[PDB]
Ligand binder design. Structure first.
Ligand code: HEM
Ligand code: HEM
Ligand SMILES: NC(=[NH2+])NCCC[C@H](N)C(=O)O
Ligand SMILES: NC(=[NH2+])NCCC[C@H](N)C(=O)O
Ligand SMILES: C[As](C)(=O)[O-]
Ligand SMILES: C[As](C)(=O)[O-]
Ligand SMILES: [Zn+2]
Lengths: 416, 414
């Protein structure tokens, strides 16, 4: 039949064809010989620091592509404003090597990038992103102000709002604007004497970086890291977030009274800050974005991963389960309760959060929407299906096609 | 070239060089990954009314023959050369060839070893291989199948096994087991479109009735087999109740669980897949091992399109099924998987939980890394349907590709 991937939902037995992938202009990591879909960091999108100005020819075509995308979204493709804008871009690139985006173009692209992210199960909210334009920012100090405003507006006292702050794009020769931290809010990872780690093992390197840069470390298991903001061609400066801006939620269980005694907690705002936002060729090296958590992110990955807090065994001992044999499913039991606790503690503190059931159901709706609007929706199965109760969610039974569309968020090399 | 594979829990890394030996193509392309698809769009297995290109078959054959002799440490040996000539000669004169028992045995085990979606491959070396090529009738197939089931079951102490019927032949119909598994529960469509029993077996359950089977009306009615001899309407055979071992499900502490009347068979034996060795195709080659608890407790019993018992258990556990956030669903799934493990252990029937299983698979990955330089794996299928990140495989990147000998999906014979 149709010459496009045939996708099936085994729960409903329904079929669809992804024609949207035909618009992908960027190759992924797979080949007919072998599939590399499970790789986290496939050396593909990897936006390596490219000092020498981008091939005006390559950039121009990427630019003409985005502009077409923009005028199309406003239903003026082929119009006078469209062709003139197209001329304006080529002109500007002709005499400067690069070009700039209009305000409304940035807003559109930022949303498309989110809309195009294959690993985000929260894309049903893609149309409501609040885009803060910070392309005027000229200092690491100013960056801190923008970030603080971002956190304030986004946190909104527990009633979270999606947002993204876009700092200056990359300029030929000049240094990039960068946020060294992986997230605006992260807990410290202190390497111990015996070799173990106190806090979040994931953040050991950045913790040692803040220290090498003048940060007086604490010694807790949940210390909020300071920010390492870097303006063009300068060494990063250190900024400490005002405690009042960083909303946190103590974790307690709805019925296991002892859970609260564990002293576990998590912050409310998930703000990825080390990803590159690419729009029409232009590269925004610093554009932290944030939404709200899906409970398994905290309860299953962050708190139970072997290489993170790894609290599975402690909670199992507390529930008095048989941690000496796998068939007792002690891991599965403790994981459930830990997840439930996160859901309970966030609801109680009136802080926005969504469970994996509600979340995936909403993504199914998002898929049905995009099927009609764009002919498909790029999705990374391994990242869409929740870390616990996979086949209990409807996404598990939905086949998915993964591919890269632009605008887009890409991983980028650490500045150091 | 060779993919760098990382394990995010240990920070360890490896390079898959085995994928280079892949001669067959998957559905992926650089433009888009289609790895999450269950069935191939084109990678099917087209009819065999005409003989395959001698050069194509001959090369697949030589390669396999090379694999065999290398396995027994006698490459370039005299026997190796003479065997290659035997194959050449047979192909050139008849358009095909035949395998010798030992080669068949080596092939079957390799097919399992190369199965990307199988998590139990650490056991790949211990496979009992029944040569059933000396078969010429559906009734003979039935006897063969009954012996496989007897041996495989072994009073609850399961043993991996496979039975290989006659290979496919040009212009001649295929020997086929119409059933997807040797043991399956009927699926009866009722008035309001709903289904009594296993919804996944509605179609096969119907074909059986159509061929004269007196259907039952239960939720776990073991279906009969529809065996087909070349170019002959399939025949109906009823499995001797004593041969089909079953496990009644109860819960270690929830006394009421058993009152649900849930049960499941002990033998997981896929029978609709095709076994390809050195270009030869075996359309009927049922194989079996032993279940991993989540296959029953999570997928078969809790899938929406299966027995979908999640809510019933939830109500009995008196859970708040008003909102998703109460995780009533996750809580019930865990007890259902627990009952499966409890029951099977209580009935002294082989079974492996998903934690033990994945740990064993990691070991296998290592054994294979050193033994062949890689191991083709399909992440979505290796990672359990529940508690994924709670198992080690979740955190292990994987490369997936097609190696031969291999098990492949083939068209439904009707
Ligand atoms: C509104 C609520 C949102 C929810 C529930 C949601 C949820 C998720 C989850 C569960 C992940 C994967 C978690 C993991 O395995 O690490 C994720 C990844 C991602 N999300 Fe969203 N998201 C939301 C908002 C945002 C926003 C506002 C943006 C962009 C402007 C966004 C962009 C992305 C990207 C790029 C990734 C993948 C990042 C990576 O590869 O590590 N998300 N999201
Ligand atoms: C010894 C115990 C075994 C265990 C515990 C085991 C476990 C598994 C599991 C969990 C799956 C995924 C099932 C699904 O989600 O549908 C699977 C798939 C598979 N296994 Fe095994 N396996 C075992 C033995 C065998 C044997 C003996 C063979 C072959 C000789 C085999 C061949 C395969 C194949 C071909 C698949 C993929 C089936 C498909 O594509 O639908 N397995 N196995
Ligand atoms: N809900 C989100 N926007 N999540 C983005 C990724 C957050 C990451 N998984 C974390 O646990 O911090
Ligand atoms: N352990 C196995 N060999 N399983 C093969 C597939 C069985 C199938 N998943 C079932 O639930 O019946
Ligand atoms: C409950 As705590 C030990
Ligand atoms: C066991 As209750 C109905
Ligand atoms: Zn792929």
């Amino acid at each position: 039949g149709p010459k496009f991937p045939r996708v099936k939902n085994w729960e409903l037995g329904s079929i669809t064809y992804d024609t949207l992938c035909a618009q992908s202009q960027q190759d992924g990591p797979c080949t007919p010989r072998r599939c590399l879909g499970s790789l986290v960091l496939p050396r593909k999108l990897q936006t390596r620091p490219s000092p020498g100005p981008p091939p005006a020819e390559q950039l121009l075509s990427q630019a003409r592509d985005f502009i077409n995308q923009y005028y199309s979204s406003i239903k003026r493709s082929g119009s006078q404003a469209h062709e003139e804008r197209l001329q304006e871009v080529e002109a500007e690139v002709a005499s400067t090597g690069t070009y700039h985006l209009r305000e409304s173009e940035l807003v559109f692209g930022a949303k498309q990038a989110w809309r195009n992210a294959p690993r985000c199960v929260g894309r049903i909210q893609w149309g409501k992103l609040q885009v803060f334009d910070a392309r005027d920012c000229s200092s690491a100090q100013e960056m801190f102000t923008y970030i603080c405003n971002h956190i304030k507006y986004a946190t909104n006292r527990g009633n979270l709002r999606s947002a993204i702050t876009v700092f200056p794009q990359r300029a030929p020769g000049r240094g990039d604007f960068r946020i060294w931290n992986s997230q605006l809010v992260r807990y410290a990872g202190y390497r111990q004497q015996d070799g173990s780690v106190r806090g979040d093992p994931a953040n050991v390197e950045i913790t040692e970086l803040c220290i090498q840069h003048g940060w007086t470390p604490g010694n807790g298991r949940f210390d909020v890291l300071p920010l390492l903001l870097q303006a063009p061609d300068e060494a990063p400066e250190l900024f400490v977030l005002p405690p009042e801006l960083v909303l946190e939620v103590p974790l307690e269980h709805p019925t296991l009274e002892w859970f609260a005694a564990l002293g576990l907690r998590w912050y409310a705002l998930p703000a990825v800050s080390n990803m590159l936002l690419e729009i029409g060729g232009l590269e925004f090296s610093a554009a932290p974005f944030s939404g709200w958590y899906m409970s398994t992110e905290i309860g299953t990955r962050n708190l139970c991963d072997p290489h993170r807090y790894n609290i599975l065994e402690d909670v199992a001992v507390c529930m008095d389960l048989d941690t000496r044999t796998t068939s007792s499913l002690w891991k599965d039991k403790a994981a459930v309760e830990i997840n439930l606790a996160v859901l309970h503690s966030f609801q109680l503190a009136k802080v926005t959060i969504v469970d994996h059931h509600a979340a995936t159901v909403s993504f199914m709706k998002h898929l049905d929407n995009e099927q009609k609007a764009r002919g498909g929706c790029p999705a990374d199965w391994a990242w869409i299906v929740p870390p616990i109760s996979g086949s209990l969610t409807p996404v598990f039974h939905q086949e998915m096609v993964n591919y890269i569309l632009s605008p887009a968020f890409r991983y980028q090399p650490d500045p150091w």
